[PDB]
């Protein structure tokens, strides 16, 4: 390995960063809405805060992200956040349905909201653009839609009666989810409290958006009414008034982004997102920057890694300088190698 394909080598009052409110929900991501719901259920509103962010504003580069102010630790992901901040068939069912919702219900909301280019272009992309500062929603929503379209593969479906394929691939997820009895204290299966927050996040992003191709809202409202009753009752209980009584930082949901969004910081985020698309050195800039941000997240955790490996940036600079130097050496050329008149005399 070039040390970028290996495990890193080590020497010998929380704040939740999330996306922004959309569709009458406190977030537009499923894992972010799950994390908001978990912290609102467990913690009190004088214990935590909610900061509106982008994956370029946190070093974890994964937006449901906790910053514990007691130890200055950076924790990314919903399962990591709930591993922090913390009969046997109930626990095994919670683990199984967490792994199932992350793996088989995540490419279904992806097909609904990001792959369908009449849904994305008319509902999803304006709601993504209304929460970022003004030069940023030209670089980040393409990367988000690209990642969600990558996740929505291994399903054989895309944006092109070829509607019964969508209905079969959505029944294959909702039939597994319909036997858990989420909005219940009795009867059926029982899971832990955090699995119900994850299920609310995915299922409420499936149901509640107002979309022009509503092929998933109607399957849920026609065949699976218990899940729709679960989403409506959970949203009426945990988030009344649309997620505006949540402790957003500095007063409101949009004024919570104003700390890490100045001219310099937003400019640097956009400049780095532009530098990663250069056709030759943009891979190695991205690898070097990702390795640097991983090193600083690990140092925030408590580890002490070995940082001295800059061969990614030097390899990218070598490739760019090699192409530029070859182009200038072959197009501008060298000075001329002879004169016009070249006399040879007969030697004596």
């Amino acid at each position: 390995m070039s040390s970028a394909w290996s495990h890193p080598q080590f020497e010998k009052a929380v704040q939740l960063h999330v996306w922004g409110p959309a569709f009458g929900l406190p977030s537009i991501d499923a894992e972010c809405l799950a994390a908001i719901a978990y912290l609102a259920q467990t913690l009190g509103s004088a214990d935590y805060q909610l900061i509106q962010s982008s994956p370029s504003a946190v070093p974890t580069q994964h937006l449901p992200t906790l910053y514990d102010s007691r130890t200055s630790t950076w924790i990314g992901g919903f399962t990591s956040i709930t591993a922090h901040l913390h009969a046997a068939s109930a626990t095994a069912d919670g683990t199984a349905y967490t792994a199932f919702l992350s793996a088989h219900a995540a490419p279904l909301l992806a097909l609904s909201l990001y792959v369908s280019s009449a849904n994305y272009g008319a509902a999803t992309r304006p709601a993504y653009s209304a929460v970022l500062p003004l030069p940023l929603p030209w670089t980040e929503p393409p990367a988000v839609r690209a990642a969600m379209a990558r996740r929505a593969a291994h399903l054989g479906l895309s944006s092109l009666k070829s509607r019964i394929r969508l209905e079969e691939a959505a029944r294959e997820v909702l039939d597994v989810l319909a036997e858990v009895d989420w909005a219940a204290g009795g009867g059926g299966r029982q899971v832990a409290a955090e699995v119900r927050c994850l299920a609310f996040g995915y299922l409420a992003l499936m149901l509640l958006p107002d979309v022009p191709r509503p092929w998933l809202r109607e399957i849920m409202e026609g065949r699976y009414p218990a899940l729709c009753t679960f989403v409506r009752d959970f949203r009426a209980r945990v988030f009344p008034q649309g997620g505006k009584l949540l402790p957003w930082a500095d007063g409101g949901a949009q004024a919570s982004a104003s700390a890490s969004a100045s001219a310099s910081a937003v400019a640097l985020r956009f400049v780095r997102a532009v530098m990663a698309e250069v056709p030759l050195v943009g891979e190695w800039w991205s690898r070097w920057w990702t390795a640097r941000k991983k090193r600083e997240v690990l140092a925030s955790k408590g580890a002490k890694p070995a940082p001295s490996n800059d061969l990614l940036l030097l390899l990218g600079a070598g490739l760019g300088l090699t192409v530029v130097g070859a182009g200038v050496f072959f197009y501008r050329g060298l000075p001329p190698f002879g004169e016009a008149v070249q006399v040879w005399r007969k030697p004596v």
């Binding site: 072959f330 197009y331 050329g333 060298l334 001329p336 190698f337 002879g338 004169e339 016009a340 008149v341 070249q342 006399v343 040879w344 005399r345 007969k346 030697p347």
Partner: protein, 443 residues
Amino acid sequence: STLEVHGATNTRRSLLDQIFKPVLEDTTTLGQVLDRVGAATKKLARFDIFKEEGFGVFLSEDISIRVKEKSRLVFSAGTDFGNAEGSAYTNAVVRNIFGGAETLTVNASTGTRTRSAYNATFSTPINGNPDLRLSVEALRSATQKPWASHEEHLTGANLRLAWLTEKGDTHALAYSSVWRQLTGLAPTASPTVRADAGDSLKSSLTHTFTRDRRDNPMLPQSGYLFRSVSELAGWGPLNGDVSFAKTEVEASGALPVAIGKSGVSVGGGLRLGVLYPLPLGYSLTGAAQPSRINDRFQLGGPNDVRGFKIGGLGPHDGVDAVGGDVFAAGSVNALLPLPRTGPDSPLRLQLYANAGRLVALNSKGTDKEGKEGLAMDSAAVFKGVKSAVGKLTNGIPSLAAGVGLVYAHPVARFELNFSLPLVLRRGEEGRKGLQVGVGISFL
């Protein structure tokens, strides 16, 4: 006496001092002076750096030579005939970097069989001989093999030392090193093509000789041609996955018949070829791996033995054309001229009849290997090559015939022949109607 060469600014005063400093050592035999100046001027144009319209040798009283240099950067694009139907090449040349040297970057993406073919070829002369060149190549290909249904991805670098001698013969000595990844298998692929599907090296070393005394390459009417390619892979200091020894001898000729200069030109030809497996390491006695489909010969086609598919004439596993180890070929021609036309148009009327054989190499008669069943020792490989050479001349070869109408372009040769197979083997896939042949190498 006093020699001046004007108008050569991107040439060193060593490259054209090796040429005209022998000339001034002449210390009243005016014809010898003029012949030596003409010989030096013909040697100077052997470097491909000057325009042919510039060479003016204006004497006085002494000498005063003038030249016009070619331009440095030559971008070019078009359509080449690399023995295929089409090609869309782009070609960037830097003509004279320091003195005599050049670079050629070729990028030929073709929708027919080779979807990409990248190149980079630096080339110098050695010690001021314009005929001895030295090239350092680097390639990356991905070429579909539709006869034996797969693709071959070839990345590597080779170092060729060409040599044109004083009698028009051309030697060559390359050290190649490739990767040769086989993939892209069609659903109609055979078990033989699936057995060899992966990565190789093939670091080889191949001599090439040519002796081209045909008066016209694209349409011969007299002369002959002898060509001898001869490779050695894997054995000794070379290292790879394959280790063989492959030779190939091709002959030709044409003999005119009388009426004037009427273009009758009874033709002829003969190809041979033997692929021998060697051990790996500095020994001849030793166990040897048998060949792979990357290395075996392919006979049949429009350019090769007229009347068959573009891979025919050999062992077929189902429909795929897997190769042989020992082959033979040959043809006769008649090339009669067209009526109401003089013997100067490139149009000719061909009457060919080819034949061919392409057999493989197996280890029957000695099968006490059992496990570790692929490697074969020297006596088994020698008896296998003896049996394959004996199986060449055992039976009437796979023969076809036909007529045609040859058009002789300066860069290619278009044929458009109507063929008719006569003798086949089973599963050999000969074509029976109108066949089209475009390219240079024909038999």
